[PDB]
Protein backbone atom coordinates (compact mmCIF):
# COMPACT_ATOMS: atom_id res chain seq x y z
CA UNK A 1 0.00 0.00 0.00
CA UNK A 2 2.10 2.84 -1.35
CA UNK A 3 0.26 6.12 -0.72
CA UNK A 4 0.60 9.91 -0.91
CA UNK A 5 -1.71 12.15 1.19
CA UNK A 6 -1.95 15.64 -0.19
CA UNK A 7 -4.02 18.72 0.63
CA UNK A 8 -3.70 22.41 1.49
CA UNK A 9 -2.31 23.53 4.87
CA UNK A 10 -4.87 22.53 7.51
CA UNK A 11 -6.86 20.13 5.30
CA UNK A 12 -6.43 17.30 7.81
CA UNK A 13 -3.47 15.32 6.44
CA UNK A 14 -2.01 14.48 9.87
CA UNK A 15 -5.43 13.79 11.34
CA UNK A 16 -6.22 11.23 8.62
CA UNK A 17 -2.71 9.88 8.38
CA UNK A 18 -2.62 8.94 12.04
CA UNK A 19 -5.73 6.81 11.52
CA UNK A 20 -4.44 5.22 8.29
CA UNK A 21 -1.12 4.15 9.83
CA UNK A 22 -2.73 2.52 12.89
CA UNK A 23 -5.32 0.64 10.88
CA UNK A 24 -3.25 -0.39 7.82
CA UNK A 25 0.23 -0.73 9.37
CA UNK A 26 2.33 1.52 7.05
CA UNK A 27 4.82 4.17 8.18
CA UNK A 28 3.73 7.83 8.32
CA UNK A 29 6.26 9.95 6.49
CA UNK A 30 5.45 13.65 6.89
CA UNK A 31 8.04 16.08 5.48
CA UNK A 32 6.80 18.81 7.88
CA UNK A 33 7.22 16.43 10.83
CA UNK A 34 10.75 15.51 9.55
CA UNK A 35 11.76 19.17 9.22
CA UNK A 36 10.46 19.99 12.69
CA UNK A 37 12.27 17.00 14.27
CA UNK A 38 15.48 18.23 12.55
CA UNK A 39 14.91 21.74 13.93
CA UNK A 40 14.39 20.36 17.46
CA UNK A 41 17.62 18.42 17.12
CA UNK A 42 19.35 21.50 15.75
CA UNK A 43 20.80 19.54 12.91
CA UNK A 44 22.12 21.17 9.70
CA UNK A 45 19.03 19.99 7.82
CA UNK A 46 16.91 21.72 10.45
CA UNK A 47 18.89 25.01 10.26
CA UNK A 48 18.51 25.16 6.42
CA UNK A 49 14.78 24.32 6.49
CA UNK A 50 13.96 26.67 9.33
CA UNK A 51 14.53 29.83 7.31
CA UNK A 52 11.81 28.90 4.85
CA UNK A 53 9.44 27.21 7.33
CA UNK A 54 9.29 30.24 9.69
CA UNK A 55 8.27 32.44 6.78
CA UNK A 56 5.68 29.94 5.47
CA UNK A 57 7.63 29.36 2.27
CA UNK A 58 8.38 25.98 0.71
CA UNK A 59 11.72 24.41 1.58
CA UNK A 60 13.68 24.11 -1.72
CA UNK A 61 12.97 21.03 -3.84
CA UNK A 62 16.45 19.60 -3.86
CA UNK A 63 16.95 19.11 -0.12
CA UNK A 64 13.27 18.06 0.36
CA UNK A 65 13.55 15.35 -2.35
CA UNK A 66 16.88 14.23 -0.69
CA UNK A 67 15.35 13.64 2.72
CA UNK A 68 12.49 11.73 1.21
CA UNK A 69 14.71 9.60 -1.04
CA UNK A 70 16.70 8.50 2.01
CA UNK A 71 13.58 7.92 4.19
CA UNK A 72 11.86 5.72 1.57
CA UNK A 73 15.02 3.50 1.45
CA UNK A 74 14.33 2.23 4.99
CA UNK A 75 13.13 -1.37 5.61
CA UNK A 76 9.80 -0.10 7.01
CA UNK A 77 8.65 1.09 3.55
CA UNK A 78 8.96 -2.38 1.93
CA UNK A 79 5.29 -3.30 2.23
CA UNK A 80 3.83 0.20 1.97
CA UNK A 81 4.15 3.78 3.19
CA UNK A 82 2.11 6.95 3.70
CA UNK A 83 3.77 10.16 2.37
CA UNK A 84 2.07 13.18 3.93
CA UNK A 85 2.69 16.64 2.48
CA UNK A 86 5.14 15.41 -0.17
CA UNK A 87 5.13 15.87 -3.08
CA UNK A 88 4.11 19.49 -2.76
CA UNK A 89 5.31 20.60 -6.22
CA UNK A 90 5.24 19.03 -9.67
CA UNK A 91 9.11 18.77 -9.66
CA UNK A 92 8.92 16.85 -6.38
CA UNK A 93 6.40 14.51 -7.99
CA UNK A 94 8.57 13.95 -11.06
CA UNK A 95 11.54 13.16 -8.79
CA UNK A 96 9.45 10.81 -6.66
CA UNK A 97 8.32 8.92 -9.79
CA UNK A 98 11.92 8.15 -10.63
CA UNK A 99 12.89 7.33 -7.00
CA UNK A 100 10.00 4.89 -6.70
CA UNK A 101 10.81 3.23 -10.03
CA UNK A 102 14.40 2.52 -8.91
CA UNK A 103 13.18 1.43 -5.50
CA UNK A 104 10.41 -0.87 -6.83
CA UNK A 105 7.80 0.89 -4.64
CA UNK A 106 5.37 2.50 -7.19
CA UNK A 107 2.50 4.63 -5.86
CA UNK A 108 -0.94 3.02 -5.74
CA UNK A 109 -2.97 6.20 -5.19
CA UNK A 110 -2.65 9.87 -4.27
CA UNK A 111 -5.34 10.85 -1.86
CA UNK A 112 -6.25 14.54 -2.12
CA UNK A 113 -8.18 15.80 0.96
CA UNK A 114 -10.08 18.65 -0.68
CA UNK A 115 -10.98 21.71 1.57
CA UNK A 116 -11.84 25.27 0.52
CA UNK A 117 -9.16 27.84 1.16
CA UNK A 118 -11.61 29.98 3.13
CA UNK A 119 -12.09 27.38 5.92
CA UNK A 120 -8.41 26.79 6.54
CA UNK A 121 -7.44 29.85 8.66
CA UNK A 122 -9.88 28.80 11.31
CA UNK A 123 -8.58 25.22 11.24
CA UNK A 124 -4.98 26.38 11.71
CA UNK A 125 -5.43 29.17 14.24
CA UNK A 126 -7.52 26.93 16.50
CA UNK A 127 -5.04 24.03 16.21
CA UNK A 128 -3.31 22.81 19.40
CA UNK A 129 -0.49 20.25 19.26
CA UNK A 130 0.86 17.97 21.90
CA UNK A 131 4.42 18.85 23.00
CA UNK A 132 5.08 15.18 23.82
CA UNK A 133 3.56 13.08 20.97
CA UNK A 134 2.67 15.64 18.27
CA UNK A 135 -0.98 14.61 17.97
CA UNK A 136 -3.26 17.59 16.97
CA UNK A 137 -6.42 18.91 18.47
CA UNK A 138 -8.67 21.79 17.64
CA UNK A 139 -10.24 24.12 20.20
CA UNK A 140 -13.61 23.87 18.52
CA UNK A 141 -13.59 20.95 16.13
CA UNK A 142 -11.57 18.28 17.99
CA UNK A 143 -10.90 19.42 21.59
CA UNK A 144 -8.92 17.51 24.26
CA UNK A 145 -10.76 16.07 27.25
CA UNK A 146 -8.84 18.39 29.61
CA UNK A 147 -8.25 21.81 28.11
CA UNK A 148 -4.55 22.51 27.29
CA UNK A 149 -3.46 18.90 27.88
CA UNK A 150 -3.07 15.86 25.62
CA UNK A 151 -5.50 12.99 26.12
CA UNK A 152 -2.70 10.41 25.72
CA UNK A 153 0.17 11.48 27.97
CA UNK A 154 -0.80 14.62 29.89
CA UNK A 155 1.54 16.73 27.72
CA UNK A 156 1.09 20.51 27.45
CA UNK A 157 -0.55 21.57 24.12
CA UNK A 158 1.04 24.37 22.13
CA UNK A 159 0.56 26.36 18.99
CA UNK A 160 2.84 25.72 16.11
CA UNK A 161 4.93 28.78 15.39
CA UNK A 162 3.74 28.96 11.78
CA UNK A 163 0.01 28.84 12.77
CA UNK A 164 -0.09 32.61 13.43
CA UNK A 165 -2.41 34.45 11.02
CA UNK A 166 0.35 36.15 8.88
CA UNK A 167 2.26 32.94 8.36
CA UNK A 168 -0.90 30.94 7.67
CA UNK A 169 -1.82 33.45 4.90
CA UNK A 170 1.63 33.02 3.30
CA UNK A 171 1.40 29.22 3.58
CA UNK A 172 -2.02 29.20 1.91
CA UNK A 173 -0.85 31.47 -0.95
CA UNK A 174 2.30 29.52 -1.50
CA UNK A 175 0.66 26.11 -1.44
CA UNK A 176 -2.41 27.05 -3.51
CA UNK A 177 -0.12 28.25 -6.25
CA UNK A 178 1.75 24.91 -6.36
CA UNK A 179 -1.30 22.70 -6.02
CA UNK A 180 -2.91 22.83 -9.39
CA UNK A 181 0.15 21.63 -11.44
CA UNK A 182 0.54 18.81 -8.95
CA UNK A 183 -3.11 17.76 -9.22
CA UNK A 184 -2.72 17.94 -13.05
CA UNK A 185 0.26 15.65 -12.83
CA UNK A 186 -1.47 12.98 -10.84
CA UNK A 187 -4.82 13.33 -12.66
CA UNK A 188 -2.93 12.63 -15.93
CA UNK A 189 -1.37 9.46 -14.34
CA UNK A 190 -4.86 8.36 -13.10
CA UNK A 191 -3.59 8.02 -9.45
CA UNK A 192 -5.51 10.93 -7.96
CA UNK A 193 -8.31 10.08 -5.56
CA UNK A 194 -10.17 13.07 -4.24
CA UNK A 195 -11.94 12.97 -0.89
CA UNK A 196 -14.19 15.68 0.52
CA UNK A 197 -12.28 16.99 3.51
CA UNK A 198 -15.16 19.20 4.78
CA UNK A 199 -16.95 16.49 6.66
CA UNK A 200 -16.68 15.16 10.24
CA UNK A 201 -13.18 13.65 10.84
CA UNK A 202 -14.74 10.12 10.94
CA UNK A 203 -16.67 10.67 7.71
CA UNK A 204 -13.53 11.78 5.85
CA UNK A 205 -11.87 8.67 7.23
CA UNK A 206 -14.81 6.38 6.20
CA UNK A 207 -14.35 7.67 2.60
CA UNK A 208 -10.57 7.04 2.87
CA UNK A 209 -11.32 3.48 4.09
CA UNK A 210 -13.67 2.91 1.11
CA UNK A 211 -10.50 3.29 -1.10
CA UNK A 212 -7.87 1.62 1.11
CA UNK A 213 -9.89 -1.57 1.68
CA UNK A 214 -9.39 -2.33 -2.01
CA UNK A 215 -5.60 -2.07 -1.61
CA UNK A 216 -4.86 -4.12 1.53
CA UNK A 217 -3.44 -7.58 1.35
N1 LIG B 1 7.16 18.67 0.37
C1 LIG B 1 7.61 19.85 0.91
N2 LIG B 1 8.25 20.74 0.13
C2 LIG B 1 8.70 21.97 0.57
N3 LIG B 1 8.47 22.39 1.81
C3 LIG B 1 7.79 21.57 2.70
C4 LIG B 1 7.29 20.23 2.29
N4 LIG B 1 6.69 19.71 3.35
C5 LIG B 1 6.78 20.56 4.40
N5 LIG B 1 7.44 21.67 3.95
C6 LIG B 1 7.78 22.84 4.84
O1 LIG B 1 7.27 22.49 6.11
C7 LIG B 1 6.21 23.38 6.53
C8 LIG B 1 5.17 22.59 7.34
O2 LIG B 1 4.68 21.49 6.50
P1 LIG B 1 3.49 20.62 7.10
O3 LIG B 1 3.67 20.39 8.56
O4 LIG B 1 3.25 19.47 6.20
O5 LIG B 1 2.28 21.65 7.07
P2 LIG B 1 1.03 21.78 6.05
O6 LIG B 1 0.89 21.06 4.77
O7 LIG B 1 0.84 23.25 6.25
O8 LIG B 1 -0.11 21.07 6.92
P3 LIG B 1 -0.43 21.05 8.53
O9 LIG B 1 0.41 20.01 9.30
O10 LIG B 1 -0.46 22.43 9.00
O11 LIG B 1 -1.97 20.57 8.45
P4 LIG B 1 -2.60 19.10 8.14
O12 LIG B 1 -3.18 19.03 6.79
O13 LIG B 1 -1.75 18.00 8.58
O14 LIG B 1 -3.91 19.27 9.09
P5 LIG B 1 -4.13 18.68 10.57
O15 LIG B 1 -4.50 17.27 10.48
O16 LIG B 1 -3.10 19.13 11.56
O17 LIG B 1 -5.55 19.44 10.91
C9 LIG B 1 -5.58 20.87 10.93
C10 LIG B 1 -6.45 21.29 12.11
O18 LIG B 1 -7.83 21.03 11.72
C11 LIG B 1 -8.41 20.03 12.60
N6 LIG B 1 -9.17 19.13 11.74
C12 LIG B 1 -8.70 18.03 11.09
N7 LIG B 1 -9.67 17.46 10.33
C13 LIG B 1 -10.76 18.23 10.48
C14 LIG B 1 -12.15 18.15 10.04
N8 LIG B 1 -12.52 17.15 9.20
N9 LIG B 1 -13.00 19.12 10.48
C15 LIG B 1 -12.62 20.13 11.30
N10 LIG B 1 -11.35 20.22 11.78
C16 LIG B 1 -10.44 19.28 11.42
C17 LIG B 1 -7.27 19.41 13.40
O19 LIG B 1 -7.76 19.01 14.75
C18 LIG B 1 -6.18 20.54 13.42
O20 LIG B 1 -6.47 21.45 14.50
C19 LIG B 1 5.74 23.89 5.20
O21 LIG B 1 4.96 25.09 5.40
C20 LIG B 1 7.01 24.09 4.43
O22 LIG B 1 7.74 25.25 4.85
CA1 LIG C 1 17.97 0.77 2.69
CA1 LIG D 1 -21.37 10.15 9.68
CA1 LIG E 1 -20.33 11.94 3.48
MG1 LIG F 1 0.57 17.72 9.39
ZN1 LIG G 1 0.42 13.75 23.41
Swiss-Prot record:
Q: What top-level class of enzyme does the UniProt entry assign?
A: transferase
User: What's the Enzyme Commission number for this chain?
Assistant: 2.7.4.3
**Region labeled LID — which residues?**
126-163
Instruction: Give binding positions for AMP.
Output: 31, 36, 57-59, 85-88, 92, 160, 171
Which reactions fall under this protein's catalytic activity?
Answer: AMP + ATP = 2 ADP
List the thermal properties of the activity.
Optimum temperature is 45 degrees Celsius. Thermal denaturation midpoint (Tm) is 47.6 degrees Celsius and is raised to 66.0 degrees Celsius when AK is complexed with the inhibitor Ap5A.
Would the keyword Repeat turn up in this protein's UniProt record? no
- Pathway of action: Purine metabolism; AMP biosynthesis via salvage pathway; AMP from ADP: step 1/1
PROSITE patterns hit by this protein = ADENYLATE_KINASE
Compartment list: Cytoplasm
Lineage: superkingdom: Bacteria
Residue positions annotated to bind Zn(2+) are 130, 133, 150, 153
Q: Please indicate if the UniProt record lists Thylakoid as a keyword.
A: no
A Gene Ontology term for the protein's cellular component: cytosol
MF (Gene Ontology): adenylate kinase activity; ATP binding; nucleoside diphosphate kinase activity; zinc ion binding
Expression triggers:
By superoxide.
Q: Which UniProt keywords apply?
A: ATP-binding, Cytoplasm, Kinase, Metal-binding, Nucleotide biosynthesis, Nucleotide-binding, Transferase, Zinc
Which sites bind ATP?
10-15, 127, 136-137, 199
Q: Which family does it belong to?
A: Belongs to the adenylate kinase family.
The record's comment about this protein's domains reads: Consists of three domains, a large central CORE domain and two small peripheral domains, NMPbind and LID, which undergo movements during catalysis. The LID domain closes over the site of phosphoryl transfer upon ATP binding. Assembling and dissambling the active center during each catalytic cycle provides an effective means to prevent ATP hydrolysis. Some bacteria have evolved a zinc-coordinating structure that stabilizes the LID domain.
Note the NCBIfam families from the entry: adk, PRK00279.1-2, PRK00279.1-3, PRK14527.1
* Function comment: Catalyzes the reversible transfer of the terminal phosphate group between ATP and AMP. Plays an important role in cellular energy homeostasis and in adenine nucleotide metabolism.
Complex formation: Monomer.
Record-given protein name: Adenylate kinase
Amino acid sequence: MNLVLMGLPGAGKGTQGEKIVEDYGIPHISTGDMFRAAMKEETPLGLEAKSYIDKGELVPDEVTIGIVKERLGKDDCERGFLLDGFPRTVAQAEALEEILEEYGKPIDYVINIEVRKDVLMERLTGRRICSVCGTTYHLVFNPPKTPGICDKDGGELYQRADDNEETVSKRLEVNMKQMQPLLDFYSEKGYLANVNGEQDIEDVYADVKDLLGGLKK
